[PDB]
Amino acid sequence: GEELFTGVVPILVELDGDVNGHKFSVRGEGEGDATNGKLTLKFICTTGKLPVPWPTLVTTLVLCFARYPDHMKQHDFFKSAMPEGYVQERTISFKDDGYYKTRAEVKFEGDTLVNRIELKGIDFKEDGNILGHKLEYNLNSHNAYITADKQKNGIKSNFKIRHNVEDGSVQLADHYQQNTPIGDGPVLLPDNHYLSTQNALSKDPNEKRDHMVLLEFVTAAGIT
To answer: Is residue 102 within 8 Å of 180, Cβ to Cβ?
Structure first.
């Protein structure tokens, strides 16, 4: 459980994706510090040009690194599933456009926390904001409420993500999410609470490949 996260942990992210038949792969490397709720990673599209904007993949590309304060450590489902891990599944519906469906496993493989994802995207517009590459390279802060899913011995959450469009409007992405443990040990089913998230997206001046440098802070709150 929580003892796996007392220091900095190396992270590996692997994604295989297919959006309107455009196949692509992403690999990410970095580290996570759950006491700061900090993540730092660099992602590379290993198959060439990424056919979707990098900010639409952030939520898909490790909530076990959220900073849970001490009065709330009994509600940290994500860390209590470790080392065996959990499955994280989402449908992400982009207003006036297509949707993603994602399945991931998050678990320890030795010293490394691994997020392995399959993503499918369906019914996108070739001239819309996603396949047309019309989103700003940023991602603003969002809050997501976590509720226990007693039936599946896990949690669920749904929340909207507001992507800035380059013409000054906003593109909504409606997230529904379901997490279930991989093992069968005891897990902490939480009271209702939320996670607050901030992101900073940048570029490596030396990196010639399509890529994203990412800093993220995730902190838990909402219980008193």
So the answer is: no
